Amino acid sequence: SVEHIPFSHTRYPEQEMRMRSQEFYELLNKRRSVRFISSEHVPMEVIENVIKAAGTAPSGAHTEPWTFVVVKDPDMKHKIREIIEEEEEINYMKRMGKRWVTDLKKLRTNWIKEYLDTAPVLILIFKQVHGFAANGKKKVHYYNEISVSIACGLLLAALQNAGLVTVTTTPLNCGPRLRVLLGRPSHEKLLVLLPVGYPSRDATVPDLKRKALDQIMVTVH
Amino acid sequence: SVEHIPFSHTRYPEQEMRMRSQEFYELLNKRRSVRFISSEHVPMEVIENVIKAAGTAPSGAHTEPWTFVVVKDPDMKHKIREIIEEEEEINYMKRMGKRWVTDLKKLRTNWIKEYLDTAPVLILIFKQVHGFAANGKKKVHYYNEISVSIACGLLLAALQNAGLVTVTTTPLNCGPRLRVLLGRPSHEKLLVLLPVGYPSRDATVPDLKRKALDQIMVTV
Ligand SMILES: Cc1cc2nc3c(=O)[nH]c(=O)nc-3n(C[C@H](O)[C@H](O)[C@H](O)COP(=O)(O)O)c2cc1C
Numbered sequence: 001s002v003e004h005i006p007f008s009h010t011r012y013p014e015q016e017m018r019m020r021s022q023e024f025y026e027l028l029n030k031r032r033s034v035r036f037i038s039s040e041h042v043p044m045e046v047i048e049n050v051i052k053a054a055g056t057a058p059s060g061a062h063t064e065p066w067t068f069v070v071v072k073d074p075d076m077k078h079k080i081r082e083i084i085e086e087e088e089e090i091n092y093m094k095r096m097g098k099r100w101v102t103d104l105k106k107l108r109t110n111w112i113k114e115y116l117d118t119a120p121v122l123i124l125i126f127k128q129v130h131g132f133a134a135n136g137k138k139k140v141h142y143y144n145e146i147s148v149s150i151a152c153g154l155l156l157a158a159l160q161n162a163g164l165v166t167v168t169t170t171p172l173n174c175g176p177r178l179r180v181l182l183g184r185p186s187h188e189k190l191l192v193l194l195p196v197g198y199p200s201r202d203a204t205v206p207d208l209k210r211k212a213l214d215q216i217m218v219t220v221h
Numbered sequence: 222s223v224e225h226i227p228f229s230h231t232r233y234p235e236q237e238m239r240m241r242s243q244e245f246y247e248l249l250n251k252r253r254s255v256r257f258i259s260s261e262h263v264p265m266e267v268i269e270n271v272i273k274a275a276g277t278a279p280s281g282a283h284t285e286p287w288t289f290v291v292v293k294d295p296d297m298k299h300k301i302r303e304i305i306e307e308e309e310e311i312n313y314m315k316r317m318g319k320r321w322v323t324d325l326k327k328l329r330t331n332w333i334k335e336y337l338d339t340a341p342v343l344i345l346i347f348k349q350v351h352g353f354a355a356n357g358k359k360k361v362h363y364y365n366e367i368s369v370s371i372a373c374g375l376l377l378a379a380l381q382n383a384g385l386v387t388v389t390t391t392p393l394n395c396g397p398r399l400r401v402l403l404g405r406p407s408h409e410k411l412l413v414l415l416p417v418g419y420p421s422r423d424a425t426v427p428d429l430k431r432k433a434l435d436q437i438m439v440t441v
């Protein structure tokens with residue numbers, strides 16, 4: 001059924017629009033995945049306000065196919081760390097394949113993940129690959145992966161705006177074990193882990209360049 | 222290859238963090254998919270900046286596997302409308318199946334898509350399923366769909382921040398036809414299509430409510 005209201009919208013005059021879009025670009029452009037996170041405590045309000053932000057993503061036919069699992073318990077965080085090192089280490093020695101580990105080299109990345117223990121909160125984003133109403137019939141979540149991914153793009157923006165850092169991780173093959181560990185139901189699958197907090201004093205990043213605009217944008221006549 | 226540098230953070234005193242993260246939530250919450258786009262011209266510098274924003278996304282092994290095809294030419298915009306409308310008609314009639322079609326009544330969409338002609342900008346996000354080294358050899362794009370989608374998330378944030386509207390659309394079975402029409406290379410696949418501009422004077426949205434925090438978040 002559902003009815004249809006007018007849309008009220010807030011416009012800015014063209015000059016203001018430009019300002020806000022340069023500035024927002026200049027802000028997002030400082031976002032860098034950080035793999036070295038201070039142990040220092042983050043305000044729980046903020047973590048909430050960024051998850052809230054993520055939950056404003058669009059989603060196939062309005063299905064909102066996403067769960068955000070927040071872990072700050074030092075002992076559950078450790079248990080996650082165990083599952084992921086065990087798996088990542090197999091992924092590096094063999095599972096990923098030679099080509100993938102080669103391609104990874106430059107980032108100086110290994111199966112050791114200090115941050116899963118040091119980061120004050122983790123965020124595990126789970127997609128719901130279908131759902132159930134209160135009625136208990138299966139519902140279809142169209143384009144669930146894209147939807148949750150967008151939402152997730154929204155998370156990254158809110159974190160960077162709120163002055164927190166993270167890295168977007170997809171720990172290969174740790175899905176099923178983390179589901180079970182975290183008591184998530186069978187219709188939910190892990191899509192990303194994000195460790196959240198302040199960068200560590202000694203935090204570094206790989207000196208990578210983003211592509212020039214004329215290499216992501218094509219105008220067509 | 223490599224090179225690793227000290228990372229420079231720009232920190233905020235906690236009170237300010239709650240304030241910024243609340244405002245940014247409120248800001249984002251006023252975004253809705255809008256399917257009635259006015260034909261007013263929008264400024265390029267802005268479309269540009271929302272794309273620069275979208276391009277600052279993370280990506281699997283720093284592959285950046287995204288191409289944003291911007292189309293403002295009315296002729297071309299029209300030929301996109303023909304293709305899509307032709308195909309969504311089939312989609313609604315025979316091809317999406319009954320369940321899906323029903324799931325969509327509440328939103329009052331069909332295969333007529335006027336914003337394809339009306340809107341002053343179309344943005345087609347394509348994902349690069351693989352790419353090419355400077356030296357011409359194939360390189361793998363790890364998690365390209367998630368990477369491109371994420372970028373797309375930042376693009377939606379950037380549109381919103383800037384006072385424009387759109388509607389994330391997935392034109393099922395339009396992929397190939399639009400690819401060739403827009404001249405794109407074989408290794409590119411259309412993800413999503415965004416008609417961008419201001420809302421029409423008349424513009425509606427369905428009256429949907431969003432989940433509350435405790436229906437999406439779970440602490441352990
Ligand atoms: C990936 C995905 C696919 C979508 N595909 C379409 C579509 O093909 N046609 C359309 O009108 N809207 C599409 N949308 C818009 C959604 O229907 C919209 O977000 C949802 O109905 C709730 O709307 P909201 O943005 O106002 O919160 C899509 C959204 C998502 C994220």
Ligand SMILES: Cc1cc2nc3c(=O)[nH]c(=O)nc-3n(C[C@H](O)[C@H](O)[C@H](O)COP(=O)(O)O)c2cc1C
Binds near residue numbers: 035281
């Ligand atoms: C979906 C996808 C998967 C990723 N997986 C990992 C990963 O598992 N481990 C890791 O350290 N970083 C991962 N990242 C972070 C990227 O390596 C990083 O985004 C890329 O090198 C560019 O770095 P930047 O975010 O600072 O721009 C992933 C990013 C994307 C979008």
Ligand SMILES: N[C@@H](Cc1cc(I)c(O)c(I)c1)C(=O)O
Binds near residue numbers: 062142328330393
């Ligand atoms: N892409 C088609 C069908 C469609 C409508 C909506 I609303 C939606 O959320 C999804 I998934 C698909 C169209 O544009 O009408």
Ligand SMILES: N[C@@H](Cc1cc(I)c(O)c(I)c1)C(=O)O
Binds near residue numbers: 170
């Ligand atoms: N997930 C592993 C390996 C990995 C590293 C990077 I850097 C990356 O972009 C991707 I795709 C995979 C790890 O976290 O070490």
